[PDB]
Amino acid sequence: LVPRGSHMRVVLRLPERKEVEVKGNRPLREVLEELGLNPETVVAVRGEELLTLEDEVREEDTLEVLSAI
Amino acid sequence: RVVLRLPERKEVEVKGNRPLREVLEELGLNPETVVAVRGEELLTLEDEVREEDTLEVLSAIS
Amino acid sequence: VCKVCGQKAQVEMRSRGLALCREHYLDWFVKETERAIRRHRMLLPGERVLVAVSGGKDSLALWDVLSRLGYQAVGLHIELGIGEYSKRSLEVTQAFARERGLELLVVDLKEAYGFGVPELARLSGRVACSACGLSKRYIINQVAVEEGFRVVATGHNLDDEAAVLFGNLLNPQGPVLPEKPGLAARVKPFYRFSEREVLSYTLLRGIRYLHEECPNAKGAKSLLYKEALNLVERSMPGAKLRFLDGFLEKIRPRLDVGVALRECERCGYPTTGAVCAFCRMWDAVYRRAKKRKLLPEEVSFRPRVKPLR
Amino acid sequence: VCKVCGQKAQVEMRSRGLALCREHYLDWFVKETERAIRRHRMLLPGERVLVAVSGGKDSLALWDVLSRLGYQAVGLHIELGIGEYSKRSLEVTQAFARERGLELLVVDLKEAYGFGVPELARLSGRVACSACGLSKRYIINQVAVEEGFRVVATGHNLDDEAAVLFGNLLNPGPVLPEKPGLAARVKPFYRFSEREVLSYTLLRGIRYLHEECPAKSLLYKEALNLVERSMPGAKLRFLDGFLEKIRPRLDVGVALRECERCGYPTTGAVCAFCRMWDAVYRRAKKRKLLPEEVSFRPRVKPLRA
Ligand SMILES: [Zn+2]
Ligand SMILES: [Zn+2]
Ligand SMILES: [Zn+2]
Ligand SMILES: [Zn+2]
């Protein structure tokens, strides 16, 4: 139950908007892999920061992943 | 129900009563890279698969 | 971790073995663009150059960079008349130009020729993608020639160029097109940059761009082409550049190819036919518009067009 | 639905707009192999041809087809010495030959040079695939030259060849002419997708080896098949386009030397195969795996070839 699970919030704008929830507390690389997204075709944004594949994303963060294509 | 051999044998059961086309789409298997064998014959994508059918999905990539 | 200064990097580029923080990435990006320019002698230092700007991430980033490099970069936007999308792209481009000191030119398809791209497509018998590109190429060249610009710059990047090359090879040009009489030079300063790198620059620079794509190009073949090339790039950093450079350096120079250009009968711009593709297209459109009461029978369209502001 | 008899099709080919039943697919596959053979002048009708066979679905299908087409198809299996894989490869390949009364030539890598591929990898300072591929290329050619075969055939298919072409472009064909010391190399299946070859192998009742050698080409194939899924026929247009419309428009350039060690074709003084084993023996002697007086002595190319 994800409303009670309340994993980290991810906004897919590829380019159309979509909100999903995936587990955080792991490198961005993993969550991008889980979402079936190619890291070379997206830019992950948190707040006002671009994230790299090694960067750690927590359960409370909100990621905006923008399609570069 | 469906034994995956891609190319190593791992069997996983799903639900039939549907075209093979969608079963492979569910399993996320590129239909141009596999061959689905039921019994002693091969199957096409428009071929509907019923329940209790044993499906052997062979990896063509080799 | 950034290479130069040691702050946390915000862009990681495996294909270059390079990681940079915001500040030094922005500096690197502006410098690499100038390197691509010098390498092909795309622009003479500080000269006038007409930039094609749709408000997209690529064209705005390009306008910014060329501006910061001391070029006289004047934007040219074409209102294609595709509903709310065209309206939003106009506003973003306008806003971009006014928030800086940049001179903006605008050509409105409907106000000029009577029809937008989709209606243009339906009547002409062309795919909307085809009619759009043809209109874009003809008009930006027309403005460049009329306003005395020597060169037009577009924001095409590496993914774009590699996808076009790939599509050619799958279903069987370059960074710089030379200047010809009645035909401005066409250059692509971003052709060594991946889409991710350009977008990263746009975000870090703070540029507000039109995120939504053109409605017509929803399932374009180029998308398929880009996805396959990027699938490779994921596991092989630098493949797209090796691919494009390989064609320009090793294949095309060894490639045997096959016609002189003529002044169009109507507008007088270079073409191989009696009448260029553009006037060939609008002649049909008007003729069928008149024939279907979509346009008054006693009207005539002058080929030449004036850009405003 | 089969396009010949209307019965239930067991193979559907969107890229060709073709669907066939078992009987007529086998017939079409065999006929399309001959078409490719004559169109590219790969083989003379009934000619002797050395066929590389590992036991895999491709090489066995090819051996089967060439035989049916009336060629003197002799198989060459190279025992590579890679654990149970290599043992089962031979067993499968031998079984095929026996049950069809076909001649099988066998070169045991370990018995010939002293080391299987795994140790060949460690001692040569080279990747397994690179060491494996170089040995296979050299030995296949050697046996062909020694046994008076004009042409060698391998089972490389459309996916294989398209991936290689793509790999070329990313990191800057089916008929390679014979040269002195160099047998002709042909790939009769180069227009068949992996799925189509496997379909033939399965429908023919050919028992093949269901596992592969323990890559770049996998990435290449994946990228192309991603295209193929949405644009049926793209791989064939890709490969056929290059070979037929691009490469003939490419400018032509080289003469091959004889290896001073073995007498086989090379660009330099000593071929990559001899330099490899020479290095292997060096590093083997120091590990005391080999007697200090041994020297790699490859069979010199017969002075009459
Ligand atoms: Zn820095
Ligand atoms: Zn004209
Ligand atoms: Zn039939
Ligand atoms: Zn040698």
Asked whether residue D27 is marked as a ligand-binding residue, the answer is no
Tell me the C-alpha distance between D60 and D157, whole Å.
13
Tell me the C-alpha distance between C213 and C228, whole Å.
20
Ligand 2 mean position, distance from CA C266 (Å): 5
Task: List chain D residues with CB under 8 Å of B45.
Answer: 12
Burial D180-194 (b: 16+ CB within 10 A, else e): ebbbbbbbbbbbbbb
B62: which residues sit within 8 A by CB, 6+ positions away?
B7, D56, D57, D58, D194, D212
Enumerate the domain spans of chain C.
1-309
Asked whether residue D52 is marked as a ligand-binding residue, the answer is yes
How far off is chain C from D255, nearest CA to CA, in Å? 21
Tell me the C-alpha distance between D162 and D248, whole Å.
17
Contact C210, C89 (CB under 8 A): yes
Tokens of C84: 């709310």
For A43, C77, C154, the CA distances from C108, given in Å and listed in that order, are 33, 8, 19
Largest CA distance in chain A: 34
Asked whether residue D139 is marked as a ligand-binding residue, the answer is no
Task: List chain C residues with CB under 8 Å of A66.
Answer: 199, 203, 211
Give the residue from D118, B8, D234, D10 showing the smallest Cα distance to C167. D234
Question: Which ligand sits closest to the CA of C26?
Answer: 1
Q: Do B62 and D212 touch (CB under 8 A)?
A: yes
- Chains with 3+ CB–CB pairs under 8 A to B are D
Phi and psi (nearest 5°) for D19? Answer: -130, 135
DSSP strand pairing (B2-5 vs B55-59): parallel
Tell me the C-alpha distance between C232 and D167, whole Å.
10
Ligand 3 mean position, distance from CA D232 (Å): 23
Tell me the C-alpha distance between C168 and C174, whole Å.
13
Q: Which of C161, C164, C170, C230 to mutate to test the interface with D (most CBs of D within 10 A)?
A: C170
Q: Do A43 and C200 touch (CB under 8 A)?
A: yes
Write out residues 4-33 of D within 8 Å (CB-CB) of B.
9-12, 19, 22
Report CA D26 to chain centroid distance, whole Å: 22
Task: List chain D residues with CB under 8 Å of B7.
Answer: 210-212
C85: which residues sit within 8 A by CB, 6+ positions away?
C212, C214, C215
> How many Å from the N-terminal Cα to the C-terminal Cα in chain B?
25
Q: Do A40 and C196 touch (CB under 8 A)?
A: yes
Tell me the C-alpha distance between D171 and C238, whole Å.
10
Tell me the C-alpha distance between A49 and A44, whole Å.
8
Q: For chain C, say whether A50 makes contact (Cβ under 8 Å).
A: yes
Q: Do chains B and C touch (3 or more CB pairs under 8 A)?
A: no
For this PDB entry, the determination method is X-ray
Report CA D39 to chain centroid distance, whole Å: 20
Tell me the C-alpha distance between D131 and D276, whole Å.
8
Q: Look-up: residue for tokens 């994230």?
A: A51
Q: Do D22 and B41 touch (CB under 8 A)?
A: yes
Task: Compute how many other C-beta atoms are within 10 angstroms of the C-beta atom of residue C137.
Answer: 16
Q: Does domain C1-309 have CATH number 3.40.50.620?
A: yes
DSSP chain C: --SSS-SPPSEEEGGGTEEE-HHHHHHHHHHHHHHHHHHHT-S-TT-EEEEE--SSHHHHHHHHHHHHTT-EEEEEEEE---HHHHHHHHHHHHHHHHHTT--EEEEEHHHHHS--HHHHHHHHT--HHHHHHHHHHHHHHHHHHHTT-SEEE----HHHHHHHHHHHHH----SEE--BTTB-EEE-TTTTS-HHHHHHHHHHHT-----SPPSS-SS-HHHHHHHHHHHHHHHSTTHHHHHHHHIIIIIGGGB------EE-SSS--EESSSS-HHHHHHHHHHHHHHTTTSS-TT----S----B-
Q: Do A43 and C204 touch (CB under 8 A)?
A: no
Q: Which of C11, C213, C233 sits opposite A15 (nearest CB)?
A: C213
- Chains with 3+ CB–CB pairs under 8 A to A are C
What fold does the segment set D1-305 form as a domain?
A: Rossmann fold (3.40.50)
Report CA D304 to chain centroid distance, whole Å: 26
Give the residue from A67, A63, A66 showing the smallest Cα distance to A9. A63
Give the residue from C273, C254, C277 showing the smallest Cα distance to C263. C273
Instruction: Using alpha carbons only, give the angle B2, B5, B7 rounded to the nearest 5 degrees.
Output: 165
Q: Which three-class secondary structure string do you get for chain A?
A: CHHHHCCEEEEEECCCEEEEEECCCEEHHHHHHHCCCCHHHEEEEECCEECCCCCEECCCCEEEEEECC
DSSP strand pairing (B2-5 vs B9-12): antiparallel
Tokens of B46: 């428009």
Q: Which of A41, A49, A54 sits opposite C230 (nearest CB)?
A: A41
How far off is chain C from A36, nearest CA to CA, in Å? 12
Asked whether residue C59 is marked as a ligand-binding residue, the answer is no
Asked whether residue C219 is marked as a ligand-binding residue, the answer is no
> Sign of the CA dihedral D122, D123, D126, D128?
negative
Give the residue from D164, D233, D235, D219 showing the smallest Cα distance to C166. D235
Task: List chain D residues with CB under 8 Å of C246.
Answer: 169-172
How far off is chain A from C90, nearest CA to CA, in Å? 19
For C188, C200, D232, the CA distances from C51, given in Å and listed in that order, are 10, 20, 38
CA atoms within 13 A on the CB side of A39: 24
Q: Look-up: residue for tokens 């043992």?
A: D87
DSSP secondary-structure letter at D299? Answer: P
Q: For chain A, say whether C213 makes contact (Cβ under 8 Å).
A: yes
Phi and psi (nearest 5°) for D255? Answer: -125, 140
Q: For chain C, say whether A47 makes contact (Cβ under 8 Å).
A: no
How far off is chain A from C200, nearest CA to CA, in Å? 7
Interface of C with D (CB under 8 A): 169-172, 221, 224-225, 227-229, 231-232, 235-236, 239, 242-243, 245-247, 249-251, 254-257
DSSP secondary-structure letter at D193? Answer: -
Q: Do D245 and C221 touch (CB under 8 A)?
A: no
- Chains with 3+ CB–CB pairs under 8 A to D are B, C
Task: List chain B residues with CB under 8 Å of D228.
Answer: 32
DSSP D109-175: HHHHHS--HHHHHHHHTS-HHHHHHHHHHHHHHHHHHHTT-SEEE----HHHHHHHHHHHHH----E
Q: Which of A15, A40, A66 sits opposite C234 (nearest CB)?
A: A40
- Chains with 3+ CB–CB pairs under 8 A to C are A, D
Return the CA Rg of chain D.
Answer: 21
Q: Do D211 and B46 touch (CB under 8 A)?
A: no
Question: Which ligand sits closest to the CA of D272?
Answer: 4
Burial D203-227 (b: 16+ CB within 10 A, else e): bbebebbbbebeebeebbbbbbbbb
Q: Look-up: residue for tokens 């390009």?
A: C62
Ligand 4 mean position, distance from CA D203 (Å): 42
For C59, C91, C115, D23, the CA distances from C215, given in Å and listed in that order, are 18, 17, 17, 48
